[PDB]
Each structure stands twice: as C-alpha cells, then as structure tokens.
Short mmCIF file of C-alpha atoms in Angstrom, two decimals:
data_model
loop_
_atom_site.label_atom_id
_atom_site.label_comp_id
_atom_site.label_asym_id
_atom_site.label_seq_id
_atom_site.Cartn_x
_atom_site.Cartn_y
_atom_site.Cartn_z
CA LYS A 243 181.96 -166.86 -90.43
CA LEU A 244 178.40 -166.57 -89.05
CA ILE A 245 175.42 -166.82 -91.43
CA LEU A 246 171.70 -166.32 -90.78
CA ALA A 247 169.56 -168.37 -93.18
CA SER A 248 166.72 -165.87 -93.12
CA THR A 249 165.76 -162.54 -94.70
CA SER A 250 163.38 -161.75 -91.80
CA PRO A 251 164.18 -158.29 -90.44
CA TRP A 252 162.95 -159.44 -86.99
CA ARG A 253 165.38 -162.39 -86.89
CA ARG A 254 168.16 -160.15 -88.18
CA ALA A 255 167.51 -157.58 -85.42
CA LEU A 256 167.49 -160.30 -82.76
CA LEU A 257 170.77 -161.86 -83.87
CA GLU A 258 172.41 -158.42 -83.82
CA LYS A 259 171.91 -158.44 -80.02
CA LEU A 260 174.74 -160.98 -79.75
CA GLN A 261 177.23 -158.49 -81.31
CA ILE A 262 178.76 -161.15 -83.62
CA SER A 263 179.10 -160.06 -87.24
CA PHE A 264 177.00 -162.07 -89.67
CA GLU A 265 175.61 -162.17 -93.18
CA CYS A 266 171.96 -162.96 -94.13
CA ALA A 267 170.88 -165.26 -96.96
CA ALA A 268 167.46 -166.55 -98.06
CA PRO A 269 167.30 -170.36 -97.64
CA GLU A 270 164.39 -170.88 -100.11
CA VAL A 271 162.87 -173.88 -98.26
CA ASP A 272 159.28 -175.10 -98.71
CA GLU A 273 157.71 -174.73 -95.25
CA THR A 274 154.52 -176.73 -95.97
CA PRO A 275 153.67 -179.08 -93.07
CA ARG A 276 153.55 -182.79 -93.93
CA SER A 277 150.49 -184.94 -93.21
CA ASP A 278 151.24 -186.61 -89.84
CA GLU A 279 153.89 -184.09 -88.73
CA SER A 280 153.72 -182.57 -85.23
CA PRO A 281 154.38 -178.82 -84.68
CA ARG A 282 157.62 -179.70 -82.89
CA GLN A 283 158.83 -182.05 -85.68
CA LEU A 284 157.98 -179.51 -88.38
CA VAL A 285 159.94 -176.51 -87.01
CA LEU A 286 162.84 -178.81 -86.08
CA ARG A 287 163.02 -180.09 -89.66
CA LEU A 288 162.54 -176.66 -91.19
CA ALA A 289 165.27 -175.11 -89.01
CA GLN A 290 167.73 -177.84 -90.02
CA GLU A 291 166.87 -177.69 -93.71
CA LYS A 292 167.20 -173.89 -93.81
CA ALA A 293 170.70 -174.11 -92.33
CA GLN A 294 171.73 -177.09 -94.44
CA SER A 295 170.30 -175.58 -97.64
CA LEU A 296 173.05 -172.88 -97.57
CA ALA A 297 175.98 -175.23 -96.89
CA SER A 298 177.39 -175.15 -100.45
CA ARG A 299 177.01 -171.35 -100.94
CA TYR A 300 178.57 -170.97 -97.45
CA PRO A 301 180.77 -174.07 -97.06
CA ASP A 302 183.07 -172.93 -94.23
CA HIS A 303 180.55 -171.36 -91.83
CA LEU A 304 178.27 -171.56 -88.81
CA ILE A 305 174.81 -171.31 -90.33
CA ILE A 306 171.76 -170.50 -88.23
CA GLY A 307 168.36 -171.86 -89.24
CA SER A 308 165.06 -171.11 -87.53
CA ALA A 309 161.34 -171.74 -88.03
CA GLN A 310 158.23 -170.97 -86.05
CA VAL A 311 154.58 -171.99 -86.05
CA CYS A 312 151.75 -171.53 -83.63
CA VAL A 313 149.12 -174.02 -82.67
CA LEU A 314 145.50 -172.97 -82.28
CA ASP A 315 143.60 -175.85 -80.60
CA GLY A 316 145.98 -178.44 -82.10
CA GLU A 317 146.03 -176.84 -85.59
CA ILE A 318 149.36 -175.61 -87.07
CA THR A 319 149.23 -172.03 -88.37
CA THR A 320 144.44 -161.76 -95.24
CA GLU A 321 142.96 -159.42 -92.62
CA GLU A 322 139.84 -161.59 -93.01
CA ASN A 323 141.26 -164.61 -91.12
CA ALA A 324 142.79 -162.51 -88.31
CA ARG A 325 139.26 -161.76 -87.05
CA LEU A 326 138.63 -165.56 -86.83
CA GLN A 327 142.21 -166.45 -85.83
CA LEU A 328 142.03 -163.96 -82.94
CA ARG A 329 138.53 -165.31 -82.35
CA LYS A 330 140.14 -168.78 -82.09
CA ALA A 331 142.95 -167.48 -79.80
CA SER A 332 140.44 -165.68 -77.53
CA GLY A 333 140.48 -166.87 -73.95
CA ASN A 334 142.98 -169.62 -74.86
CA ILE A 335 146.64 -170.47 -74.41
CA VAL A 336 148.31 -170.41 -77.83
CA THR A 337 151.62 -172.25 -78.02
CA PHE A 338 154.36 -171.15 -80.38
CA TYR A 339 157.05 -173.65 -81.36
CA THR A 340 160.37 -172.24 -82.49
CA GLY A 341 163.00 -174.53 -83.99
CA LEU A 342 166.66 -173.54 -84.10
CA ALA A 343 169.63 -175.17 -85.82
CA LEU A 344 173.29 -174.26 -85.83
CA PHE A 345 175.08 -176.08 -88.66
CA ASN A 346 178.81 -176.02 -88.97
CA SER A 347 179.27 -176.42 -92.78
CA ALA A 348 183.05 -176.82 -92.31
CA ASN A 349 182.85 -180.07 -90.27
CA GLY A 350 179.16 -181.04 -90.51
CA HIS A 351 178.43 -180.76 -86.77
CA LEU A 352 174.74 -180.01 -86.16
CA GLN A 353 172.94 -178.66 -83.10
CA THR A 354 169.18 -178.44 -82.89
CA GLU A 355 166.60 -177.33 -80.37
CA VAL A 356 162.88 -176.62 -80.32
CA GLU A 357 161.60 -174.21 -77.70
CA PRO A 358 157.95 -173.61 -76.80
CA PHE A 359 156.42 -170.28 -75.74
CA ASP A 360 152.86 -169.92 -74.46
CA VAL A 361 150.75 -166.86 -75.04
CA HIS A 362 147.72 -166.70 -72.73
CA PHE A 363 145.10 -164.56 -74.46
CA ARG A 364 142.48 -162.48 -72.67
CA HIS A 365 138.85 -163.25 -73.33
CA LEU A 366 138.28 -160.91 -76.27
CA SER A 367 135.01 -159.29 -77.47
CA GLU A 368 134.27 -158.97 -81.21
CA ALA A 369 134.80 -155.18 -80.99
CA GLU A 370 138.31 -155.52 -79.50
CA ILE A 371 139.19 -158.07 -82.20
CA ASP A 372 137.75 -155.68 -84.83
CA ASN A 373 139.57 -152.66 -83.41
CA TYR A 374 142.89 -154.57 -83.27
CA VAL A 375 142.73 -155.82 -86.87
CA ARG A 376 141.70 -152.29 -87.97
CA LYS A 377 144.97 -151.12 -86.33
CA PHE A 378 150.46 -159.98 -84.03
CA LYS A 379 153.21 -157.77 -82.56
CA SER A 380 153.99 -159.32 -79.15
CA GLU A 381 156.74 -156.69 -78.72
CA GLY A 382 154.19 -153.96 -79.61
CA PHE A 383 150.44 -153.37 -79.60
CA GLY A 384 149.59 -157.08 -79.27
CA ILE A 385 150.31 -156.72 -75.55
CA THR A 386 146.72 -155.37 -75.33
CA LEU A 387 145.45 -158.90 -76.10
CA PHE A 388 147.42 -160.93 -73.53
CA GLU A 389 146.85 -162.13 -69.98
CA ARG A 390 150.33 -163.67 -69.61
CA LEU A 391 153.42 -164.68 -71.58
CA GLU A 392 155.07 -167.94 -70.47
CA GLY A 393 158.37 -169.30 -71.73
CA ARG A 394 162.11 -169.48 -71.24
CA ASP A 395 163.01 -166.58 -73.49
CA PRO A 396 160.85 -163.69 -74.85
CA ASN A 397 163.16 -163.53 -77.91
CA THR A 398 161.87 -166.98 -78.90
CA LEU A 399 158.38 -165.56 -79.23
CA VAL A 400 159.65 -162.87 -81.62
CA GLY A 401 161.32 -165.63 -83.59
CA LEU A 402 164.85 -166.53 -82.55
CA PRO A 403 165.71 -168.48 -79.40
CA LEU A 404 168.72 -166.42 -78.38
CA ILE A 405 169.48 -168.04 -75.02
CA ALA A 406 169.51 -171.44 -76.76
CA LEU A 407 171.60 -170.02 -79.63
CA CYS A 408 174.19 -168.65 -77.19
CA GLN A 409 174.59 -172.16 -75.71
CA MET A 410 175.05 -173.65 -79.20
CA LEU A 411 177.62 -170.95 -80.01
CA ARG A 412 179.45 -171.66 -76.73
CA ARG A 413 179.70 -175.34 -77.77
CA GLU A 414 181.21 -174.31 -81.09
CA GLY A 415 183.80 -172.24 -79.19
CA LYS A 416 182.20 -168.91 -80.16
CA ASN A 417 180.78 -167.59 -76.86
CA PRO A 418 179.47 -164.14 -77.79
CA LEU A 419 181.17 -162.94 -74.58
CA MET A 420 184.70 -163.77 -75.91
CA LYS B 216 143.48 -137.61 -70.47
CA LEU B 217 146.36 -140.09 -69.85
CA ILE B 218 149.42 -138.78 -68.03
CA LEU B 219 152.72 -140.56 -67.36
CA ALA B 220 154.31 -139.47 -64.11
CA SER B 221 157.87 -140.28 -65.05
CA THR B 222 161.24 -138.78 -65.97
CA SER B 223 162.27 -142.08 -67.71
CA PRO B 224 162.64 -142.18 -71.51
CA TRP B 225 162.12 -145.98 -71.72
CA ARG B 226 158.86 -145.77 -69.75
CA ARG B 227 157.71 -143.27 -72.36
CA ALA B 228 158.79 -145.57 -75.18
CA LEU B 229 156.98 -148.51 -73.55
CA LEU B 230 153.73 -146.65 -72.96
CA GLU B 231 153.73 -145.73 -76.67
CA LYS B 232 153.15 -149.41 -77.44
CA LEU B 233 149.57 -148.93 -76.24
CA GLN B 234 148.90 -146.18 -78.86
CA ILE B 235 146.92 -143.98 -76.45
CA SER B 236 147.57 -140.26 -76.36
CA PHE B 237 149.47 -139.16 -73.26
CA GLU B 238 151.70 -136.46 -71.89
CA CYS B 239 154.63 -136.85 -69.48
CA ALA B 240 155.48 -134.87 -66.42
CA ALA B 241 158.14 -135.24 -63.75
CA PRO B 242 156.70 -136.37 -60.39
CA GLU B 243 157.52 -134.93 -56.95
CA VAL B 244 158.48 -137.78 -54.55
CA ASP B 245 161.05 -138.86 -51.96
CA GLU B 246 162.66 -141.91 -53.66
CA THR B 247 164.76 -142.64 -50.55
CA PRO B 248 163.99 -146.07 -49.09
CA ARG B 249 162.61 -145.73 -45.58
CA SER B 250 163.78 -147.77 -42.59
CA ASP B 251 162.78 -151.45 -42.74
CA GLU B 252 160.81 -150.82 -46.00
CA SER B 253 160.82 -153.99 -48.10
CA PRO B 254 161.50 -153.96 -51.87
CA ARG B 255 157.84 -154.53 -52.72
CA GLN B 256 156.72 -151.87 -50.23
CA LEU B 257 159.15 -149.38 -51.72
CA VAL B 258 158.06 -149.78 -55.34
CA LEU B 259 154.35 -149.80 -54.41
CA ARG B 260 154.80 -146.63 -52.34
CA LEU B 261 156.83 -144.86 -55.04
CA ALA B 262 154.46 -145.83 -57.85
CA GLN B 263 151.44 -144.45 -55.89
CA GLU B 264 153.33 -141.33 -54.80
CA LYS B 265 154.50 -140.47 -58.31
CA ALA B 266 150.97 -140.72 -59.73
CA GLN B 267 149.45 -138.74 -56.86
CA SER B 268 152.07 -135.97 -56.95
CA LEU B 269 150.57 -134.72 -60.25
CA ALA B 270 146.92 -134.63 -59.04
CA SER B 271 146.93 -130.84 -58.56
CA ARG B 272 148.59 -130.23 -61.95
CA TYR B 273 146.36 -132.79 -63.69
CA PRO B 274 143.05 -132.86 -61.80
CA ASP B 275 140.78 -134.59 -64.33
CA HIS B 276 143.08 -137.30 -65.67
CA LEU B 277 144.36 -140.88 -65.48
CA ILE B 278 147.87 -140.68 -64.08
CA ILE B 279 150.39 -143.54 -64.29
CA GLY B 280 153.15 -144.03 -61.80
CA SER B 281 155.78 -146.78 -61.81
CA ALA B 282 158.96 -147.70 -59.97
CA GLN B 283 161.35 -150.62 -60.16
CA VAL B 284 163.94 -152.19 -57.91
CA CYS B 285 166.48 -154.92 -58.41
CA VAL B 286 166.86 -157.49 -55.64
CA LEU B 287 169.86 -159.81 -55.23
CA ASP B 288 169.85 -162.19 -52.25
CA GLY B 289 167.07 -160.22 -50.54
CA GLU B 290 168.93 -156.90 -50.81
CA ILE B 291 167.98 -153.94 -52.93
CA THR B 292 170.80 -153.40 -55.42
CA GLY B 293 171.46 -150.04 -57.03
CA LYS B 294 173.50 -148.81 -59.98
CA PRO B 295 177.13 -150.01 -59.76
CA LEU B 296 178.67 -146.69 -60.89
CA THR B 297 182.15 -148.31 -61.16
CA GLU B 298 183.46 -151.23 -63.18
CA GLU B 299 184.57 -152.87 -59.88
CA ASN B 300 181.03 -152.70 -58.51
CA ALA B 301 179.61 -153.95 -61.86
CA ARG B 302 181.81 -157.05 -61.67
CA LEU B 303 180.79 -157.52 -58.02
CA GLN B 304 177.07 -157.37 -58.84
CA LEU B 305 177.48 -159.89 -61.67
CA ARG B 306 179.41 -162.25 -59.33
CA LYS B 307 176.41 -162.06 -57.02
CA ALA B 308 174.05 -162.66 -60.02
CA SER B 309 176.07 -165.63 -61.32
CA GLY B 310 174.24 -168.95 -60.91
CA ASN B 311 171.55 -167.03 -59.02
CA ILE B 312 168.15 -165.44 -59.64
CA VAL B 313 167.87 -161.65 -59.80
CA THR B 314 164.37 -160.44 -59.00
CA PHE B 315 162.95 -157.16 -60.20
CA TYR B 316 159.87 -155.79 -58.48
CA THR B 317 157.96 -153.26 -60.54
CA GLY B 318 155.23 -151.21 -58.85
CA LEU B 319 152.47 -149.70 -60.90
CA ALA B 320 149.73 -147.23 -59.97
CA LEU B 321 146.88 -145.68 -61.93
CA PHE B 322 145.30 -142.68 -60.17
CA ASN B 323 142.10 -141.17 -61.54
CA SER B 324 142.29 -137.60 -60.29
CA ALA B 325 138.68 -136.94 -61.44
CA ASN B 326 136.98 -139.56 -59.20
CA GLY B 327 139.94 -140.39 -56.91
CA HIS B 328 140.12 -144.12 -57.72
CA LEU B 329 143.64 -145.51 -57.09
CA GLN B 330 144.77 -148.91 -58.37
CA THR B 331 148.16 -150.33 -57.46
CA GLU B 332 150.02 -153.53 -58.22
CA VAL B 333 153.53 -154.93 -57.77
CA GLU B 334 154.69 -157.46 -60.36
CA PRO B 335 157.88 -159.52 -60.05
CA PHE B 336 160.18 -160.69 -62.77
CA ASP B 337 162.95 -163.26 -62.22
CA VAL B 338 166.12 -163.39 -64.29
CA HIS B 339 167.89 -166.77 -63.89
CA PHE B 340 171.62 -166.45 -64.55
CA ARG B 341 174.06 -168.90 -65.99
CA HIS B 342 177.07 -169.77 -63.87
CA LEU B 343 179.52 -167.22 -65.22
CA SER B 344 183.32 -167.32 -65.32
CA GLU B 345 185.46 -164.42 -64.17
CA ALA B 346 186.46 -163.91 -67.81
CA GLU B 347 182.81 -163.75 -68.91
CA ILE B 348 182.06 -161.19 -66.21
CA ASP B 349 185.09 -159.06 -67.13
CA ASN B 350 184.23 -159.23 -70.84
CA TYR B 351 180.56 -158.29 -70.40
CA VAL B 352 181.39 -155.27 -68.24
CA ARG B 353 184.10 -154.07 -70.67
CA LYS B 354 181.83 -154.46 -73.72
CA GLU B 355 178.54 -153.28 -72.19
CA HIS B 356 179.66 -150.76 -69.52
CA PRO B 357 176.43 -151.23 -67.53
CA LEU B 358 177.52 -148.71 -64.92
CA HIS B 359 174.10 -147.03 -64.63
CA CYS B 360 172.01 -150.23 -64.69
CA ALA B 361 170.92 -151.59 -61.32
CA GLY B 362 172.20 -155.20 -61.25
CA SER B 363 174.86 -154.36 -63.88
CA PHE B 364 173.21 -155.89 -66.95
CA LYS B 365 170.83 -154.91 -69.76
CA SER B 366 168.17 -157.60 -70.28
CA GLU B 367 166.89 -156.26 -73.60
CA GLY B 368 170.32 -156.37 -75.29
CA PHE B 369 173.65 -158.14 -74.92
CA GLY B 370 172.66 -159.24 -71.40
CA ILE B 371 170.81 -162.21 -72.98
CA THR B 372 174.30 -163.76 -73.18
CA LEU B 373 174.32 -164.14 -69.38
CA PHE B 374 170.94 -165.74 -68.76
CA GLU B 375 169.60 -169.29 -68.38
CA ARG B 376 165.97 -168.24 -68.43
CA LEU B 377 163.53 -165.40 -67.83
CA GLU B 378 160.50 -166.00 -65.63
CA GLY B 379 157.61 -163.54 -65.39
CA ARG B 380 154.18 -162.56 -66.63
CA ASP B 381 155.23 -159.77 -68.96
CA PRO B 382 158.66 -158.94 -70.55
CA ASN B 383 157.79 -155.26 -70.40
CA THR B 384 157.77 -155.47 -66.61
CA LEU B 385 161.47 -156.30 -66.70
CA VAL B 386 162.07 -153.22 -68.93
CA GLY B 387 160.23 -151.12 -66.27
CA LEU B 388 156.51 -150.80 -67.10
CA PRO B 389 154.02 -153.69 -66.53
CA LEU B 390 151.89 -153.23 -69.64
CA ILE B 391 149.59 -156.19 -69.26
CA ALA B 392 148.83 -154.98 -65.73
CA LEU B 393 148.47 -151.37 -66.94
CA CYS B 394 146.03 -152.43 -69.68
CA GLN B 395 143.91 -154.12 -67.03
CA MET B 396 143.90 -150.95 -64.87
CA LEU B 397 142.98 -148.84 -67.93
CA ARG B 398 140.07 -151.14 -68.80
CA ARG B 399 138.85 -150.89 -65.20
CA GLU B 400 138.72 -147.10 -65.76
CA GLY B 401 136.85 -147.49 -69.09
CA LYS B 402 139.92 -146.65 -71.18
CA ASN B 403 140.72 -149.88 -73.05
CA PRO B 404 143.52 -149.24 -75.54
CA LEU B 405 141.43 -151.40 -77.91
CA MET B 406 138.30 -149.22 -77.45
#
C-alpha cells in the first residue's frame, strides 16, 4: 500500500521509523531548477512529480515524494567544491528546504508541504574546512561544524519530514499509531 | 587522552560521532536528587561529579561527564517501569511540552580546568487520544525511558515539534556544546 519514490538509503531508513511496511521505487525525475524558481517552489514541485511519476506503476497506493535543496546566500545547491561550499557556509545560517508529497494514486488526493531547517555554521578556519573534507553528515561528524540547528523536525534535515508525513498519513486514515 | 565517564551505551555511540579516541569508565557518584535541588542543578551537579570521580584514575586527561533529566510540569519524571505508569506519563505529555535538561562537564585533570553547561531541549506533543497512548505503549514498551517515549524512533509519531539547539542533546550528549569545550582545551575534533 505505501510506496517511497526514492532509492535514497537515508530516506528509506527514516521512513522505517514509522513501522509501516513500504516498497521503494526510483522516480526518475529531472531535478534541475528552472530559471525564476524559488527554493520552496522547486522542492514542492519535485516532491509532487516524484510521487505522481509512479502513479501508473503503483496505481492503488499512497506514494511518498520528497526533495531537498540548500540555499547558500540565496543560491540553490567533487571534493573540490566542498572546500568552497563550506567556505561559503562558514559563519552563516544555511537554510535547507525539504518538500514532501503524499499522493493517493487510487483517488488522486494530494497533500504537500515544504518545511525549512536552518543550520547555523560556526566561523570556520581553512584548516578545519580542509581537515573535514579530508575526513555533510548532520547526524554524524558534521556536528563539529555547527553552532545551532533550528527547525521543527531534525528528520527533515536528514531528508524526510516525518512529523509532517505522520499528519498527512493521519488524514489518509493511516495513523502509524493504529 | 579523552575519557567518557559514563555507563551508558548511547553516550558512547554519540561520542563516536566526533571521531576522537576515547576510553570509557564507570563514574562514582550519588545520583540521588537532594532536597529542593532543581532539575538543572541536579544534572549540572551530576555531570561535574561524574567527570571528577575519575580524576584519580585518569590524572592527565580530559574527562567528560553528562546527565539528563526529563521534566513534565516542573517535576522530574523517571522511568515508568509499568505500562500503567507509561500511559500516565504520556497523558501528562499530551498537548504539553516535555523538557529535557542535559548537563555536561569537561574536567581537565592535568590542569584542573572544569567547564560545565546545562542545555535544554523541548519536545512539543500532539494532543493524543487514549487509543493512541495505548497503542504506542503496547508497540514501543518504553518502560525504561524517562517520559515513556523514544524520540529517535517511533516516538516521532507523537510529536508536534522539537525545539532545541542540538538533537544530540535530546539523545543524552550535547555534542555542539562538547565540541566547544574541547576546542577551549585545544582538542578540536577537526584539528
């Protein structure tokens, strides 16, 4: 009944927390941002399309779609760039936007939500940045780079807004608790 | 050089995230709350005491101590132990905020420098039905979790939002705060 339109092992792991059986499937959606598209609009669209793209292969199902980007001074986002990309993040608040869609392919009902999560980075030195790339995992070693994590749900940062998903599931009469 | 003064397997797992060599040892402390001791005073005291209790065993080291308490309507709340008490705790949590205070201490036994901090984390609950409460307890059996839920797992099904500096703090070790203390002692995990 429940389908995750993703082959991400992180998203898979997160969904397993809800203890509802599901199957994974790759959506094969082009995630390239459009010209005048905001971060919020983009992940919203991508979440929806990923869920809707599987509707014929899984035509009597609740299909979960999700997408995430981060914004580094208003820009949507090799080991070579990480040095710069961490250099860009340094001393700044980097906002992640995570879109979520639950599509009922049986009756066409769609629920969507976009949830922000702010990562406040420490002022980093070049050495730190170098050392870190030599060795981001917000649930792991990336904690060494942060001053503060600010958002509704730490699962969102990892890539699936589970609190929001539970609400959507409750609306579809599939409270994980029942 | 780094020592974790803890009998907790999850504190060990969390500290590993920093990728610094350490050893664990069980601390020697009275964990009993004292009379009129507030939740924040308790976890600060216990964190400092755990770290300091290993100073003679580990006299040239950085020693980490930590303690956590769960607070519901101003009252320290322990492990439920029974299903009845688990349902009771969750009724108290329902539509409410559960606050965890996590004390942290780093004691340098070589130069005697002690750093301590208490960091809160607030778990905002949904308004839960009796059926939801009964189902969670039966599925999860959180009988040895103070507050009667597991935030890192199926407990996410109960929450409206999570409010705090660092998700690790909720799991029982404030890692952002610990990193700061380690840097202050010239032991940056990134160095």
